Design a binder for this molecule. Structure first.
Ligand SMILES: N[C@@H](CN[C@@H](CN[C@@H](CC(=O)O)C(=O)O)C(=O)O)C(=O)O
Ligand code: NI
Length: 499
């Protein structure tokens, strides 16, 4: 059936609550729910659910003129009342969204007519419009699907305005989406998409070459990298790599020994032979990362010094910090205690598992004993949130989060950064300066603030940058060339065309 496609994903899409996080998958929230304004590859936004808008002299009050022709997928109208109700449900759970500064800025959301929605901020918050465009939390479920006039405690049906409708959800088996034939924009050419829930990356690969699935669209790590490289040589498949979009790095816990020592974290940054890891384990499909953000990230081309591969420097740094080698033993000890570190990652990620292996062996070469721990994604995120990790795999967030929303998130438990930074004496300063860089309209001062924040995080070796990864695609040749969505976690199913 040509206008239907089957694909695969490590987990289910989740309840598809538009205002909550994992277990909801962002690509799926974005299929069903839509923003007021839509993010573009060039960095701007365009009208979406909001046809047009104005704002006050001081920039604190924004009036949005909504379209009069949008319906939720069950036929109910999307209007200013519905959007206000959504914003109210979101901000009734405001603390959950404190990582994103817009959630701290919205004082009031008023419906003025059926088509006029007024949003009031406590300052002229320049990233306003980009954060409204994100996959979550500021997208719209029909108010009829609230539970007790809230969404923070669950939803009835995942009824959005978008071009896809969640039709069926079988746990640990599949999810099914059908086209919304009453979508207000372009009717997608695909009629139905089935997601098979396949957590093992080898089984996803086999699912593809048996022909059981048509497409794989995800981060590097959705397939074994050696399989993907062979797929790319096979004229019977089609494959793609986008330009790099995210950093993959380890967060090092400056709060827990032994990673709370600067000398230890610097040694670990010298320990990994990244050029070999990339050229070998990852098949040249990435680039060596020396900093938390790539030089191409806005405000991030700071000329920071890289830590290149230097086992001998690493050993010297450990010696001088009192981690020495007993006689006839490979693992350093200090004051009776061997140098042991725990390295946790999401088990279903082929890239994380594969890098964890190389990293472990590289760090043993300098006398550090690293234990690998692979777990379900919910357990890894909870670890990042509460500080229970030694070294934990991490990644930045792509456009448009990088750098401003990623930094904003460092100020509360979010991903691993807040907890990983608790050991830094200048952590409060960094957080103060993150708040300033999000508030300033002075271009010169905005660059100064980014440089200082990013140079402090670099100099104190909070991260072990590994590589800058790309989006990866595998598809039947019939689907032709697949486009990329400007937001890294979204999948542009509505632009795919059958033969
Ligand atoms: N992802 C974890 C924690 N999520 C963070 C916020 N991160 C953003 C961006 C991203 O993850 O690409 C988001 O998730 O929408 C928070 O809750 O502060 C979860 O689902 O809980
Ligand atoms: Ni997140």
């Amino acid at each position: 059936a040509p206008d239907e496609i089957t694909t695969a994903w490590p987990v289910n899409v989740g309840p598809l609550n538009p205002h909550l996080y994992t277990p909801n998958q962002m690509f799926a929230q974005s299929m069903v729910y839509e923003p007021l304004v839509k993010y573009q590859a060039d960095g701007s936004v365009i009208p979406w659910l909001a046809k047009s808008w104005t704002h006050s002299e001081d920039g604190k009050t924004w009036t949005f003129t909504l379209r009069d022709d949008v319906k939720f997928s069950n036929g109910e109208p999307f209007d200013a009342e519905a959007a206000a109700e959504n914003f109210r449900a979101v901000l009734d759970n405001r603390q959950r969204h404190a990582w994103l500064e817009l959630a701290n800025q919205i004082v009031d959301v008023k419906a003025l007519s059926k088509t006029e929605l007024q949003i009031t901020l406590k300052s002229a918050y320049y990233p306003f419009l980009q954060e409204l465009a994100l996959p979550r939390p500021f997208r719209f479920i029909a108010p009829s699907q609230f539970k007790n006039h809230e969404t923070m405690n669950g939803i009835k049906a995942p009824i959005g305005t978008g071009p896809w409708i969640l039709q069926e959800s079988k746990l640990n088996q599949y999810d099914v989406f059908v086209r919304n034939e009453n979508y207000w924009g372009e009717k997608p050419a695909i009629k139905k998409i089935t997601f098979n829930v396949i957590p093992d990356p080898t089984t996803r690969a086999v699912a593809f070459e048996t022909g059981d699935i048509d497409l794989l669209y995800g981060n590097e790590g959705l397939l074994p990298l050696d399989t993907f490289a062979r797929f790319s040589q096979n004229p019977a498949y089609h494959t793609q790599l986008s330009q790099p979009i995210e950093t993959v790095m380890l967060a090092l816990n400056t709060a827990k020994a032994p990673t709370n020592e600067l000398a230890v974290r610097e040694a670990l940054n010298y320990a990994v032979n990244k050029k070999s890891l990339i050229d070998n384990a990852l098949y040249g499909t990435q680039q060596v990362a020396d900093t938390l953000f790539a030089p191409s990230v806005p405000y991030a081309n700071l000329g920071l010094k890289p830590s290149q591969y230097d086992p001998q420097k690493a050993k010297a740094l450990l010696e001088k910090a009192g981690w020495t080698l007993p006689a006839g033993k490979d693992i350093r000890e200090k004051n009776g205690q061997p140098l042991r570190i725990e390295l946790s990652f999401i088990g279903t990620d082929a890239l994380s598992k594969s890098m964890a292996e190389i990293i472990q062996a590289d760090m043993r070469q300098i006398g550090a004993d690293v234990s690998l721990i692979g777990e379900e994604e919910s357990s890894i995120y909870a670890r990042q949130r509460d500080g229970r990790f030694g070294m934990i795999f991490h990644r930045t967030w792509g456009a448009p989060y990088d750098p401003h929303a990623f930094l904003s998130s460092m100020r509360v438990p979010s991903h691993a950064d807040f907890q990983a930074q608790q050991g830094l004496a200048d952590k409060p300063l960094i957080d103060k300066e993150i708040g300033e860089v999000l508030a300033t309209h002075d271009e010169t001062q905005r660059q100064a603030l980014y440089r200082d924040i990013l140079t402090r995080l670099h100099d104190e070796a909070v991260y072990l940058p590994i590589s800058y990864i790309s989006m990866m695609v595998v598809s039947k040749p019939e689907l032709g060339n697949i486009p990329y969505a400007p937001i890294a976690t979204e999948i542009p199913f509505e632009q795919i065309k059958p033969v």
